[PDB]
Design a protein around this ligand. Structure first.
Ligand SMILES: [K+]
Ligand SMILES: [K+]
Ligand SMILES: [K+]
Ligand SMILES: [Mg+2]
Ligand SMILES: [Mg+2]
Ligand SMILES: [Mg+2]
Lengths: 514, 516, 514
C-alpha cells in the first residue's frame, strides 16, 4: 500500500508505528517547505537554479554578515534563477525571499592563527577599544558595553557555539578576570551567549532598522526577527515595516529562556515562529531543547500559524556527502512533530554539498509526511480549536475530512489573499493543496504552510465569474497533471468562491480530473 | 508541578506537546539504559571507573577489531573498575558486558605506504581478489575479503565503501575481478566497510571466526551477544546453538542491518531475546530516509512484545571531536527514548572519542528529560490494549502495580526477582517511577540493564530461614538504596512486589508502603 | 463467550453495541442492589423470607403512611426473616433496613366514591378545616397553610401523580378559584405538587424529626431524606441523627428543580443520592427527567458515592405477571448508566406480583451489568479523579485493573469500616466483590455499592494477625464456592491488611481458589 495507508488505519499510536512499512512508497508530492540560507557555496545563479530544482522554496539571507551591496546581489540572483522558469507557468515554482535580522548578539574582536586556551587557565576580558585587533590567551574584547552591570561574580560565559566556557573571578569597571572551564581554539568574530542574564540591549537596533527598511525596498516576503523576548519586540518590527511593508510576514525566532516563557504573547503578535535550536541550545541547557521545540510546534499548529524548525538538522553534510543517522531521524521528527518548514543554515551557506542536503530534506520529508497519523492528528486539531465557530475553518475541516475519505489526490483552492488556503493547511490534509493565485506576494508567502503548492496564474481575468473560476481550476488541474500529483480518473476536492464578492472560499466540489 | 506532571494530564497528544515545560525539573532517576562501547579512549580502569559514575550501564565489545587477548584485557579492566565499588553494596552499580560479533562484513585491504587515496567522479577503480594486493590498494586497484563477490554482483550494481560515502557502479564483470566507475568520490583509507544492497551475499551469518568469538564469550562469561547481520530466524538459532548449554543464559540481541532483516522481523523477534536497530549499516542497505520508519516499527513491535530494543549508531557522533553535541543529535537521543528505546548506544564517541565522559553525561542528561516528557497514561492504555488477548497472571500483577504507581505518584517500584522475569514484566508497561529490582543473582542483575526503568541491586546478604524475614531484608536493602541514591526520602510512597511464599514462581504479592 | 467478553474488546462504543450477543450468558453474580418497599403485599414473614431468596438487599419503609406501631412491626418482621438464614453464615445474606422520610409534601382531604372533574369546569380550593371531610367537584382542602403567599394568579397545580391539572383564576385569603385543564377521578389523601414555586416548608418538620429519631432507636442502616434542596437540609438531618446515629447513611432524594441546580453541594454533604423520577417528573417537565437521571448517576459514580434509581421502573407489574418492554429497557439503562441500586416502590408494596418483580430486576440487572463497556468506563473513572492522589484509590485501581486482565472470578476484600471495599466498587470491577467483615452495620450498609457482596464473619478473632487474615479469606473463598461465583482452579484477587494497624487494605494477592 502507498503512503503508509495501512498504518493510517491504526486507532492506536503504538499500533500506528508497528505498521509503518519501508516497502510503502510515498506520494510524489512533498508538503514540508525547505528553507535554504544562500551563502558563498550557493550564491551563483547557476547554483541557485539547481536548488529550486532540488526543492528550495524559501531563500534565507542572514544579516549577521555581509554589507547591503552584498545581500542586494544575492536577492537579485535569486529572482534571476526563479524567472528562468516563468516561460512556462505550469512548471513554475514561486520562490520566497527571506530576511533574517542580526539581533542583539555579542561577538569578539580579532586575533593579533587560532589561539589555544588551556583547561584551568587565567584569562582577562577588557572592553577597551585598543584591544579590537589584539586578542590572545590572556586578553579579549567584546561588543557588550554594559556587560559589567548585568554580569555577576561566578557567572558562566559561552563563546563560539557555546563550545568555550568561562567563569568570572573578578568584576570591575570594564575588566573581567575569567577562569577557563573547557577551552580550545579561538578565532575572530565568534558569538557570545549569556544564559541566566538580563540582556537589556535593544530588540531592534539602528542596524536592524536599516536591515528591515532595506527589506521593504528590496521587496522581501518575510522576516526572521532575532532574539525576540516579548510582544513589544514584534510590535517594533511591524512599526519599522509600517504601511509600506505591512504585508511582509514576521516570523519570530525564539532563542532565549524569556522567549520560551512568553511564547503565548509572541505567537499571537507574529505571523510565524522559528525554533532556533542553535542559540536556544546555549541559552537553555542543551538537553531541554527538544522539549521547547515540541512545545512551540504544538502551539503553532494549534494556532494555525507557520512554524520553522531550524539549525544543524544536517550539519555533517557541510563536509560529507551523507548525513549521520542522528541527523536523519531529527529531520523526520521535525515534520512528524508538525513543523510547516525545515531550515538549512550552513549546509547551504558554506558546505561542500549544497544540492545533496536539499534533496535529502526532500526525501526525508515526504517519507515522514506519510508516516503521520493524520486522522488522529486531525481530531486533535479540531478539538483544540472547537471554541472557534469560524466559517472558513468550517469550509476547511469539511474539505479535509472529504479528502481523507475518498483518498483524494489533492485539494484545489482558489485564493487571492492566501487566507483561505492557509486554513485548509492548518487542518493537515494528507494530499497536497494546489492553491491558485494571481497575487505574486501571496504565492511566495504560501510556502510557509505545510501542504500548500502555490501556482501563479498569468492568465487575464475573465468577465463572467464562472469562466474565471473554471479557467483557474483547469490550470490547477494542469499543474497537478504535469507535476504528476494526479491523472484523469483520479478525484480531487475543489474550493472556489460562489460569487465575486464572497469573502472566503465557500464552495466545495468533489470533481474527477478531466 | 515537578516532572512534566502537567503534560501528563493532557488527554490529547497535541495538548501534551503544548504543555511541555522547560522549567519543569525531572526526577533524579534515569530509566533508559546506556550502552558504551569500550575502545582506546575508555579502556583504562581509571577512565572506566568514571564512566560507571557518569552512568554507564553496559560495556560493548566490538569484535570487528582486536585479538582475543585484547578483549580479555578490556573485560578484566571493566570488572576491576566494577569491583572497586563492591565494598559498599548499597552504592554498588552492576555493569553489563556485551559481545558484539564481527559477522559477515566485507572490508577493503590497506593503502600503499598521501597515505589516503583520492577517488574522483567518473574515474575507474579496479577491484581485485588477488592477495598480492592485500596492502597495495590505491586509486586504480582495490582489494576485498569476499572471495565470492562476483557470483552475487551484476553489471550496474552499486557498491558502497566506508560507511556509504563512496559509491561505485559495476561496468565490467569477471571471475575474480571487477571494473567499476566512481559515482561520487572521497578519500579512501585502509580496511573500510563495504556494502552490497540488492545483492544476496552468500557469506555465513555465523562463520568459523564467529564461533571462536562466541565460544570465547561463554568462558569469559558475557551477559549478552549483539548478533550482527541477522537476516532470518534460522540465523538466531545458529548463534543460540553455538552458545549451547553453557551459554544458555546469555541473551541474544539480534542486530537488524539489512532489508531482509526488516522484512522478516516478526520471526527474528520471537526467536531473539532482544533487538538492536543498527542504524549505521541499515542506512546503507536501505535508503537513509526510510531508516526512521524501520526504527519506529522495531521499537513499537518490541515494546508490544516486552523484549528489549536498543537504539544504536551515530547518536552523538560530533562528540568524537567536540565537547558539545549538535542539535540534531540532541533531539535524536530524546526521540529514541520518547519512541520507547529500552537502551541507547554510543559507538565512536566512547571508543575513539576525545570526550568519552562528556558523551555518557549528555546521554544521561537527555534521557531523563525525555522520560518525563513521555505520555505515560496513553502509552499504558495502548500497551494494555495490545496484550489483552494474553491473561498471564504476572502480566496482571505488573499492570495493577503500574496503575497503582500512577495514582499515588509512587517514587519507586521495588521488585524481588531471581530470574528477572517479574521485573521485566513490570518494566514493559513503562511506569514513570524507577523500578528497583532486588536480586541475589549476579548475572540477573547485569542482564536487567537491558530493560527500561529497572535499577538492578545485587544483594550479598545470606538467605534467611524464614521467608518473611528474607523478603523484608531484601526490601530493607532496596529502601536504603533509594535513600542513598536520592530516589526517595522518608515519607515517600513506594510499590513493593514480592512473592507470598518460596514456591510462588512470580511476584504475586503487591503492597503500597511508606518509606521508613 | 460468557459475560459479553467479545463486546468487551470493542474500543468503540458503536462497535461495542454491535457485538452484544443474546447467546452470551452472564455470570451467576449480580452486582446491582435491589431495594424493595415493604407494604401490605410483602409485609408477612413468610413473604419477606421469599424476597431475600428472590434478591432483596435493602428494605425501604415509606413514612408518608402508617403509624410508629405499624412500621416497628415491619422492621421486626424483616429481622426475623433475615435471621432465619443465620444458622449457616456461609449462605447468609445481610439485609439492610431503610427509612424514607415523609418530607414537606402537600396532600388533600376526604370526599363527602371518587369525584369526577370535567375538562373546563369551575373549582374552588378553600383552606378551611371544616372542609377536611367534605370535598367534591367544587370544594377542596389542602395542607399548605401559606399557599396563597407563594401561589400566583395563572399558576398550574398538579394533584395526584400530576394527572390532574388546575389553573388559578382568583386569589384570596385562603380561597382559590381554579379552572380545570385536564380532570378525572379524585380520591382522598392525594399528593399535590407545585412546579415553579418556592416551597418554604421546613426541610425536616417535627414529624420528620420523630421519624428519624425512631430510626435511631430501631437501628436503621440508612435514611432516604425527602425533597432536599440545599446543604442545610442534609446538615439538619445529620444534626437530628447526632452522635447516636452518626454512622447511619444519609441518602438524599432529589425531587425538585432546586435540588437539581444545587446537586454539587447536596452530594458532598450526603453519603448517597436518590433519583426520585416520580416526584421529579411533576416538578420538572416529564421529558427532561432522563437528562437529570444521567447527570446525577454520572456525578455519583465520579464522586464514588452510591446512587439509587427509583420509582415506576416496573409499574405494570402491580397488576400483571410481566412488565412492559419500556419498563424492561429502563431497568437495564439504569444499570448501564451506572446506578449502584435499583428501587421497587409500589410493585412490592401493593402489587399482585411482589416476587416476580424482584426476580425480574435480578435477571435484567446481571444482563446489563455484563453489557457495560468496563475498560472504557474504567479509564473515564480514572480520568475523572486523576487529581486525587489517595492511597486506597491506588490500591483499588490496581486491584480492578488486575481483575480485568486475568479475568478473575472475584475480588476478596477484608474490610472493617467498609471504606476499603467501597473504593474498589467505585472503579467498577466486572467480577463481584466479596467483602468480609465482622461489623454487622458495615455488612448491611455495603449493599449501597455496585458489586459488593458482603459476608458477616461469625468466627472469633485470632491471636496472630496472619491466621486472622487467613481464616477470613478461606471464609470468603467458601462463600464464592458455595454461592457459585467460582471453583478450585479459578483465580481471584485478594485485598488484605499487612499488619493490624494498617488504616486501609494495603496488600494485594493474586491467588488461585484452594
Ligand atoms: K542571526
Ligand atoms: K560489529
Ligand atoms: K415519601
Ligand atoms: Mg541566532
Ligand atoms: Mg553493523
Ligand atoms: Mg417523593
Amino acid at each position: 500500500q502507498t503512503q503508509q495507508l495501512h498504518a493510517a488505519m491504526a486507532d492506536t499510536f503504538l499500533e500506528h508505528m508497528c505498521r509503518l512499512d519501508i516497502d510503502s512508497p510515498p506520494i510524489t508530492a512533498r508538503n514540508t517547505g525547505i528553507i535554504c540560507t544562500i551563502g558563498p557555496a550557493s550564491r551563483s545563479v547557476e547554483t541557485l537554479k539547481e536548488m529550486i530544482k532540488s526543492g528550495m522554496n524559501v531563500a534565507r539571507l542572514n544579516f549577521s554578515h555581509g554589507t547591503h551591496e552584498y545581500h542586494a546581489e544575492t536577492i537579485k540572483n535569486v529572482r534571476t534563477a526563479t524567472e528562468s522558469f516563468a516561460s512556462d507557468p505550469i512548471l513554475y515554482r514561486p520562490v520566497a525571499v527571506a530576511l533574517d535580522t542580526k539581533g542583539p548578539e555579542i561577538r569578539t574582536g580579532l586575533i593579533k592563527a587560532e589561539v589555544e586556551l588551556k583547561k584551568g587557565a587565567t584569562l582577562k576580558i577588557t572592553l577597551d577599544n585598543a584591544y579590537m585587533e589584539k586578542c590572545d590567551e590572556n586578553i579579549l574584547w567584546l561588543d557588550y558595553k554594559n556587560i559589567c552591570k548585568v554580569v555577576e561574580v561566578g557567572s558562566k560565559i559561552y563563546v563560539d557555539d557555546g563550545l568555550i566556557s568561562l567563569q568570572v573571578k573578578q568584576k570591575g569597571a570594564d575588566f573581567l578576570v575569567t577562569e577557563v572551564e573547557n577551552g580550545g581554539s579561538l578565532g575572530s568574530k565568534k558569538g557570545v551567549n549569556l544564559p541566566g542574564a538580563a540582556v537589556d540591549l535593544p530588540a531592534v537596533s539602528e542596524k536592524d532598522i536599516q536591515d528591515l527598511k532595506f527589506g521593504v525596498e528590496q521587496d522581501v516576503d518575510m522576516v526572521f526577527a532575532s532574539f525576540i523576548r516579548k510582544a513589544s519586540d514584534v510590535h517594533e518590527v511591524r512599526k519599522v515595516l509600517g504601511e509600506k511593508g505591512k504585508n511582509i510576514k514576521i516570523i519570530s525566532k525564539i532563542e532565549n529562556h524569556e522567549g520560551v516563557r512568553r511564547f503565548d504573547e509572541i505567537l499571537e503578535a507574529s505571523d510565524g515562529i522559528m525554533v532556533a535550536r542553535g542559540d536556544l541550545g546555549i541559552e537553555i541547557p542543551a538537553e531541554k531543547v527538544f522539549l521547547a521545540q515540541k512545545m512551540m510546534i504544538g502551539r503553532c499548529n494549534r494556532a494555525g500559524k507557520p512554524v520553522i524548525c531550524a539549525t544543524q538538522m544536517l550539519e555533517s553534510m557541510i563536509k560529507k556527502p551523507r548525513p549521520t543517522r542522528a541527523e536523519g531521524s531529527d529531520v523526520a521528527n521535525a515534520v512528524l512533530d508538525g513543523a510547516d518548514c525545515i531550515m538549512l543554515s550552513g549546509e547551504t551557506a558554506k558546505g561542500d554539498y549544497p544540492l545533496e542536503a536539499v534533496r535529502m530534506q526532500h526525501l526525508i520529508a515526504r517519507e515522514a509526511e506519510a508516516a503521520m497519523f493524520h486522522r488522529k492528528l486531525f481530531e486533535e486539531l479540531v478539538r483544540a480549536s472547537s471554541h472557534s465557530t469560524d466559517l472558513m475553518e468550517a469550509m476547511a475541516m469539511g474539505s479535509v475530512e472529504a479528502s481523507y475519505k475518498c483518498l483524494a489526490a489533492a485539494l484545489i483552492v482558489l485564493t487571492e489573499s492566501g487566507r483561505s488556503a492557509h486554513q485548509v493547511a492548518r487542518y493537515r490534509p494528507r494530499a497536497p493543496i494546489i492553491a491558485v493565485t494571481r497575487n505574486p506576494q501571496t504565492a511566495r508567502q504560501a510556502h510557509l504552510y505545510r501542504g500548500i503548492f502555490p501556482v501563479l496564474c498569468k492568465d487575464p481575468v475573465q468577465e463572467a465569474w464562472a469562466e474565471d473560476v473554471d479557467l483557474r481550476v483547469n490550470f490547477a488541474m494542469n499543474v497537478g497533471k504535469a507535476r504528476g500529483f494526479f491523472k484523469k480518473g483520479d478525484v480531487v476536492i475543489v474550493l472556489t468562491g460562489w460569487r465575486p464578492g464572497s469573502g472566503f472560499t465557500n464552495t466545495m466540489r468533489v470533481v474527477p480530473v478531466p
